[PDB]
Amino acid sequence: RPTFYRQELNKTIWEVPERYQNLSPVGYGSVCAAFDTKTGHRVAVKKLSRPFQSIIHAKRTYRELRLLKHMKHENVIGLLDVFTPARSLEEFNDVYLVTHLMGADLNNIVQKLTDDHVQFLIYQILRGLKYIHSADIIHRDLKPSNLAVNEDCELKILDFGLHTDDEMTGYVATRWYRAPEIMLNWMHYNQTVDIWSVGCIMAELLTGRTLFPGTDHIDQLKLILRLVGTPGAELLKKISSESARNYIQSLAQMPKMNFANVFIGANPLAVDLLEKMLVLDSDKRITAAQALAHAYFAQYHDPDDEPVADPYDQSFESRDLLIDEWKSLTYDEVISFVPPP
């Protein structure tokens, strides 16, 4: 067990191992930047706020720790350390998570981007997604502010979806990248919702403009259906709510637009890929593994260097436990953590 030291920074007590120095507040928890003297990296240290206050919060704390401990891929955020100052389960109350400190996100770039930049950035998102989806994990919240990018144009996916009603209302970027079947609760969704988000991000890199900046859910749906067309009978059969089906059928029918006349002057191979991502019926969207083999990425695709994940057991999600049982499971995962090389 390392030696810990305590200090108050901006109304909160931080008790951390000596290896972490020069803590500086930066921003579910509070975050400080710090220098990790054991590894030489600048890191983000997050102190979770009230991690075990309710059953829902205790289970969410466990879910986040299990997910971050599993993610080991060049294009996905990983866990550098996790610690508690508690010496026993009986006094266990606080959880601290340590990751690499991220500078710019895709917004702080979306600069002057060549087609070669768009190829490389979208390739890396799909490479990370192939890995995430191979573990039957759905990210659910892909958008430019959840993508870290450095000076060398290298990219990492972060901030997995572990959002409320008010957060999704009105003219808000939190909703502009969401697939329509989850925005309006049409059906049980699956990993294909993430590919819809990649399509929205790719279109924005190519044009410099948000693809579907709706002023509310309904305005956004109208923008979407004007581009991709209104649904046919095949998709309508898959929407569970009779009211939602009734609303769809109240709209005048529209054909799918010509994407070459929307994305004027774009690489024809980029146009072709966008048509395969932005498909209304989620069953028919291209998958991440299929998209990596698309000719738009010929310059970067290497099927021997696009790895999949170890199997991931999510059976805990259907388990009904008490607060102190979720807390003990979390404690076990903190003390069994093994750092990366």
Ligand SMILES: [NH3+]Cc1ccccc1N1CCC(CO)CC1
């Ligand atoms: N700067 C915008 C841009 C760059 C490249 C290709 C298309 C576009 N616009 C996208 C929106 C279109 C309106 O529907 C107008 C053109």
Ligand SMILES: [NH3+]Cc1ccccc1N1CCC(CO)CC1
């Ligand atoms: N929001 C404008 C925009 C920005 C970039 C690229 C395409 C677009 N439109 C998206 C909406 C489409 C109809 O809804 C028309 C084209």
Ligand SMILES: [Cl-]
């Ligand atoms: Cl230490």
Ligand SMILES: [Cl-]
């Ligand atoms: Cl990382």
Ligand SMILES: [Cl-]
């Ligand atoms: Cl504690």
Ligand SMILES: [Cl-]
């Ligand atoms: Cl964003």
Ligand SMILES: [Cl-]
């Ligand atoms: Cl009609």
Ligand SMILES: [Cl-]
């Ligand atoms: Cl597992």
Ligand SMILES: [Mg+2]
């Ligand atoms: Mg975020």
